[PDB]
């Protein structure tokens, strides 16, 4: 999941012809001041750049309240920025000590006379891109769909022909833009669709997509989700991925191309294959345990991945037991059994291990684990494995 700061996704849009508030990003109070002067705006918005939400009502360690401020005076932008940069911003959704703020965005503050919802997403159900819009904007689209389905409009876009003028106009008219604003919106829609294609997004959501009293159609805030599979051709974008607000283990796991997802349990588990990994988390819950994480080593499993997985599970202190379930994959069980006992010995793990191995050379593999001296239980099948793992940890 690529995570872009507000200033990064807005830069991406503006570099691509999409209309966004004019803005600059600053590293220093001084830079913030000078940027507020350049903007040449009637009203300036100063915004701390952190990924977490709730900036508006957050509090910095400098004592300053609010990660978002408005002012008409450049110098005040500098003064407030000085009380932001370098300090930690805590909000309703950040760890307790908040997040250090290295940058602030200084943008022209625009009024919103009208807000609508606009999205473009790869819709599995439609075999391709779809333009989704609703005149009822500012609100999470899900709720609108709940109460007022009749207010959500969709246009299927043919990937080969691209977006048709007709389609953009009709969508703009459905979102209630009128007269000249209607053509301006239709044109922003085409620009957004091209941007969506260009950066391998699976979704570009503009909310609010709207107009200013001054008759301007602007993408006020946006959220972009990227196709991870497109990374090899989007290196500049994936490079700016902010992993500084991520669960450390999740970052670590990414270093090795391991798909790790932290959960709340105490039974760690690692499996080769996403379906099998989800089913393992499911069967541990069905037998009354709480999985500590989801971890897919992928179907073809290598000894070094088993090893990195143990090293990973070593950082989580909640783990009280580990369930290993490997089935399939081109490497034979005896090699896997070997890396298991070696990982155990070298990382000094002492938590009980429940192991389910199925494949080539399992007898030998079974022998290797039983002869290891380590606290290792070899399970009959998945149900047995889950039951034994659940029996190995606390209430």
């Amino acid at each position: 999941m690529v995570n872009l700061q507000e200033y990064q996704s807005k830069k991406l849009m503006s570099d691509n012809g999409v209309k966004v508030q004019r803005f600059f990003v600053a590293d220093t109070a001084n830079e913030a001041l000078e940027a507020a002067k350049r903007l040449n705006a009637k009203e300036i918005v100063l915004k701390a750049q952190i990924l977490a939400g709730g900036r508006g009502k957050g509090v910095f360690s400098s004592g300053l309240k609010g990660g978002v401020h408005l002012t008409k005076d450049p110098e005040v932008v500098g003064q407030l920025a000085k009380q932001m940069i370098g300090y930690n911003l805590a909000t309703k959704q950040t760890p307790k000590e908040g997040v250090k703020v290295n940058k602030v965005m200084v943008a022209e503050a625009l009024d919103i006379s009208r807000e609508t919802y606009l999205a473009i997403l790869m819709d599995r159900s439609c075999n391709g891109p779809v333009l989704v819009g609703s005149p009822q904007g500012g609100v999470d689209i899900e709720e609108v769909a709940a109460s007022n389905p009749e207010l959500i409009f969709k246009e299927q876009i043919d990937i080969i022909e691209g977006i048709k003028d007709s389609q953009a106009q009709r969508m703009a008219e459905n979102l209630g833009f009128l007269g000249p604003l209607q053509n301006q919106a239709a044109d922003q829609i085409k620009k957004l669709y091209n941007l969506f294609l260009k950066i391998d997004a699976t979704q570009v959501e503009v909310n609010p997509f709207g107009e200013t009293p001054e008759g301007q159609v602007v993408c006020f805030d946006a959220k972009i989700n990227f196709d991870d599979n497109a990374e090899f051709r989007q290196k500049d974008i994936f490079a700016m991925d902010d992993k500084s607000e991520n669960e450390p283990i999740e970052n670590e796991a990414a270093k090795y191309d391991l798909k790790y997802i932290g959960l709340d349990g105490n039974i760690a588990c690692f499996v080769n294959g996403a379906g099998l990994a989800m089913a393992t988390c499911d069967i541990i819950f069905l037998n009354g345990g709480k999985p500590a994480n989801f971890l897919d080593l992928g179907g073809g499993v290598k000894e070094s991945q088993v090893y990195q997985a143990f090293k990973l599970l070593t950082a989580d202190p909640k783990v009280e037991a580990i369930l290993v379930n490997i089935f399939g994959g081109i490497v034979n069980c005896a090699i896997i059994a070997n890396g298991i006992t070696k990982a155990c010995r070298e990382l000094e793990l002492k938590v009980p291990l429940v192991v389910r191995l199925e494949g080539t050379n399992v007898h030998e593999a079974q022998n290797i684990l039983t002869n290891s001296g380590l606290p290792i239980t070899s399970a009959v099948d998945l149900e047995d494995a889950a039951k034994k793992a659940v029996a190995s940890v606390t209430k």
Binding site: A230, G273, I283, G299
Partner: protein, 306 residues
Amino acid sequence: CSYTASRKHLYVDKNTKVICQGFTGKQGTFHSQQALEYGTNLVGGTTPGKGGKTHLGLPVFNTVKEAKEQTGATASVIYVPPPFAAAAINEAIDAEVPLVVCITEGIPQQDMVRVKHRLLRQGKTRLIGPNCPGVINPGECKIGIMPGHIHKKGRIGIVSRSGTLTYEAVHQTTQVGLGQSLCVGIGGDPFNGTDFTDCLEIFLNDPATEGIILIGEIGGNAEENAAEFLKQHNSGPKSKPVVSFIAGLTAPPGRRMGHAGAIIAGGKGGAKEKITALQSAGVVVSMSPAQLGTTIYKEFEKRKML
């Protein structure tokens, strides 16, 4: 002409002749050797720029077209890296290869949307995948990466969105002696060439398939579409036992659970809605992935089909 027309090419058998695209790379080589020992009729393969070579004692061709012409292959299995995988699938479609199995994981969604666009407007080529383990007719033809030894020719047709979870279902039905007629892994990607209904149709019409196991997971609505197909076609007078397991009951929303298509997004794609929909279509849902074999066994026993 219509894409549904190609459904039938899904049923590989002892007569199926196969070529491998990405034949000379490390993956293509390894699985081609396993295909050969299994007894699959692997007849050659391609790698652009390396035709005129032999590999694994078989000929290598620069194009799918030449390979097809020279060997008469009716199937192609693709192990090409992501950056070139879509061009590989398109090349196979242009050559009108009856069945294309794309193993490759990591193809951009945008590339697959374009591929599916071509796919739906033709009826000669059937595509399974991408990001799938392949298809196997036990003892006759193996195309893909699944371990051959756990399979046993028999009565259960199995279709699944996942890889290694399918091996659980195979192993469980081999242990209780039912065996499998045909196993098809449709893959974990959001955009792909074959869904559950495509397989169900083949299964319902196959005299050799007496029961079906359908393995699904969170995300999309392929399972719900499968339940509708079953309400229409397997609700009587015809009725084959169908057992299912849906993975992801405990998955957290908003995260891609390994598979690109395994995500609960916008509150759509959750597991229990799929379980509910399948039950209402006559399907016996096994809450535990360890009980697929015993569950379908009991269904056979109740219908006095053992």
